């Protein structure tokens, strides 16, 4: 099929995002959609593969926990245009203004959060940068996971998601399942304390050198009383220093939906 759109159809608004590498607008077609944009206007042959890769791993999603891709264009600058999202992030409302959801809703997040990752996985798909900013409440109901940093391409890292492995650059590939499976024990532990790992350290430096080493690990002790057993337990699975410990998604999935109807 063809998910290219010839230009003039869309109507570029508001800018809502600027990066690095690329801008993101709120436009016009056939209702509302997000436009990120690409702005260099002699693209290298770099950007414009990156370009290629990116909307060919899109193409490839059909689920309502990912973000919809929508079509693109090269037309006058490069552009990927997606569903546009009315909300805000998760880290918006866990660690900006703080919203406080009910116990039965974080629970809810954490599922649906699973459910994209179990598609993306087994799609073939490994996120490699999972993380709350990552994670869209689409009208405070729905989670949409995509993408949305506007620089990397390694650039810098989030580094409170990264796995002991990743951090330990052994391997020229230390990205997998099990990786991404940290990654959202640390989203886990997000939704069950409505805290950033490691509040209490000022060195990334020191972060870095001491997750990798094995010498530090998110306080499990921060997580809210009315958390259920089933939770910090999984949550903890998740977090294993050791990657072939960690549970995958089919198995982390349904351990929520058996803990959530109770
Ligand atoms: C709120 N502020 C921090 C400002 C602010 C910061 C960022 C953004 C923002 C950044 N991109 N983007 C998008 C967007 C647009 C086009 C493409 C993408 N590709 C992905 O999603 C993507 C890419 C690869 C894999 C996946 C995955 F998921 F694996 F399938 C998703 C995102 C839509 C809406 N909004 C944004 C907006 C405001």
Same mark, same amino acid.
């Given at each position: 099929?063809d998910w290219?759109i010839p230009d003039?159809?869309?109507?570029?608004?508001?800018r809502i995002?600027?990066?690095?590498?690329?801008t993101?607008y709120?436009?016009?077609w056939?209702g509302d959609?997000?436009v990120k944009?690409?702005?260099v206007?002699?693209?290298?042959?770099?950007?414009?593969?990156?370009?290629?890769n990116e909307?060919?791993?899109?193409?490839?999603?059909?689920?309502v926990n990912?973000?919809?891709?929508?079509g693109?264009?090269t037309?006058?600058?490069l552009?990927?245009?997606?569903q546009?999202?009315?909300?805000?992030?998760l880290?918006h409302?866990?660690?900006?203004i703080?919203?406080?959801?009910e116990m039965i809703k974080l629970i809810?997040?954490?599922?649906?959060?699973?459910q994209?990752?179990?598609?993306?996985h087994?799609?073939?798909?490994?996120?490699?940068d999972?993380?709350?900013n990552?994670?869209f409440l689409?009208?405070?109901?729905?989670?949409?996971?995509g993408?949305?940093?506007?620089?990397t391409?390694?650039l810098? =890292?989030?580094?409170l998601?990264m796995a002991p492995?990743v951090?330990?650059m052994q391997?020229?590939?230390?990205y997998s399942?099990?990786?991404?499976?940290?990654?959202?024990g640390?989203?886990?532990?997000?939704?069950?304390?409505?805290?950033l790992?490691y509040?209490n350290?000022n060195?990334?430096?020191?972060?870095?050198?001491?997750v =990798?080493r094995?010498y530090?690990?998110?306080?499990?002790?921060?997580?809210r009383?009315?958390?259920?057993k089933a939770?910090?337990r999984?949550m903890?699975?998740?977090?294993k220093?050791?990657?072939?410990?960690?549970?995958?998604f089919?198995?982390i999935?349904?351990s929520?939906?058996?803990?959530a109807?109770?």
């Amino acid at each position: 099929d063809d998910w290219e759109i010839p230009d003039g159809q869309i109507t570029v608004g508001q800018r809502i995002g600027s990066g690095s590498f690329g801008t993101v607008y709120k436009g016009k077609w056939h209702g509302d959609v997000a436009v990120k944009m690409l702005n260099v206007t002699a693209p290298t042959p770099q950007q414009l593969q990156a370009f290629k890769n990116e909307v060919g791993v899109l193409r490839k999603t059909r689920h309502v926990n990912i973000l919809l891709f929508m079509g693109y264009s090269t037309k006058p600058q490069l552009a990927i245009v997606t569903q546009w999202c009315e909300g805000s992030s998760l880290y918006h409302h866990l660690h900006i203004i703080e919203t406080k959801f009910e116990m039965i809703k974080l629970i809810d997040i954490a599922r649906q959060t699973a459910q994209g990752m179990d598609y993306l996985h087994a799609k073939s798909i490994i996120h490699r940068d999972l993380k709350s900013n990552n994670i869209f409440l689409h009208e405070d109901l729905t989670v949409k996971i995509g993408d949305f940093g506007l620089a990397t391409v390694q650039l810098s =890292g989030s580094i409170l998601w990264m796995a002991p492995e990743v951090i330990r650059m052994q391997d020229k590939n230390p990205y997998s399942f099990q990786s991404d499976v940290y990654a959202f024990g640390i989203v886990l532990y997000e939704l069950m304390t409505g805290q950033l790992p490691y509040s209490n350290i000022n060195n990334r430096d020191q972060i870095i050198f001491m997750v =990798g080493r094995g010498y530090l690990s998110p306080d499990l002790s921060k997580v809210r009383s009315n958390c259920p057993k089933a939770m910090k337990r999984l949550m903890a699975e998740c977090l294993k220093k050791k990657r072939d410990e960690r549970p995958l998604f089919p198995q982390i999935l349904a351990s929520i939906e058996l803990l959530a109807r109770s």
